């Protein structure tokens, strides 16, 4: 399901992502635009037997388990299909432990490439939340 800006930003506000470590809702919604275009069921394959899952394109190597990736560490202890739900809870929860691993939101290639060092607060400018 392709979410829509403020609908997603309202549910992420709700899920405590606001100012989680030092990242305001501008960043969380920004990543979800440039990682997936807000499509909950978005998948993308990588160069090493791994897929990225959901809104926030969590990699099946380190973070979730899909049972066909090698080097699977599954650090969020979750099936990656749990990450393809139209309700952001398991995605928010694993996002917390990704942003906690001492790297901040750098783990997200598109956040790093399209949302870092810009006016990320733009992403909810005009939004109810």
């Amino acid at each position, epitope marked *: 399901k392709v979410f829509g800006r403020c609908e997603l930003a309202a549910a992420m506000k709700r899920h405590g992502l606001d100012n989680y470590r030092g990242y305001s809702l501008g960043n969380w919604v920004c990543a979800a635009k440039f990682e997936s275009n807000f499509n909950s*069921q*978005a*998948t*993308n*394959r*990588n*160069t*090493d*037997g791994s*897929t990225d899952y959901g809104v926030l394109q969590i990699n099946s190597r380190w973070w979730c388990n*899909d*049972g*066909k990736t*090698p080097g699977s560490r599954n650090l969020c202890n979750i*099936p990656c*299909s749990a990450l*393809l739900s139209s309700d952001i809870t398991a995605t928010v929860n694993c996002a917390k432990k990704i942003v906690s691993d001492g790297n901040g939101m750098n783990a997200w290639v598109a956040w790093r490439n399209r949302c870092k060092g810009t006016d990320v607060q733009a992403w909810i400018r005009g939004c109810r939340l």
Partner: antibody
Amino acid sequence: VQLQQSGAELMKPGASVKISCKASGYTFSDYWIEWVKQRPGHGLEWIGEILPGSGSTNYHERFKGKATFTADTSSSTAYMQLNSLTSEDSGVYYCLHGNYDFDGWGQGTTLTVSS
Amino acid sequence: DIVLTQSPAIMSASPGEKVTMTCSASSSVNYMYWYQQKSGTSPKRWIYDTSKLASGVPVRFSGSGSGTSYSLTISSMETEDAATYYCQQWGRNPTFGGGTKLEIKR
């Protein structure tokens, strides 16, 4: 309770066709079913795949737009649709598993596109 | 993505003797997968994740390599090892290799 496919097709150029894969016996919802194409003499080409539960699909560069996947959770069937068939689409299409719990392929559907 | 070239395309061996098939990737790849296809059946996954044999590959097969060169080696060629073997880089967009045909000698 098998990875079963549809019989062989014979189709006019220009039309579309749909191959089933009645993937039965496990929690369908939970595993990716891939699809491969075999042109005898040239061998294998990977089409793409679909995770029944979520409707998520990945397609190879070459088959995006030529192929579409669907899955119907209640009959535990998965289907591939070939758009706009030409002669160079004649081959055997295989559905398969490739995870750490099983890896069975289906037997193939041959498809002849001819007038 | 990567082009996989297999050498040789047809090959022969007697029962009892040692077989090595080679597959070359145009780019570095992280893992290689081998599938075997006998005439008249759908291929079967034979070695996965570069060295792990699939359920039902007899212990006489083993595969290796890294980056550019991988290989499938049979130590005793048994008659039932005659098929085509194919390699696949199962990457962002998977490609298969041409194959190698194994005929038994007489």
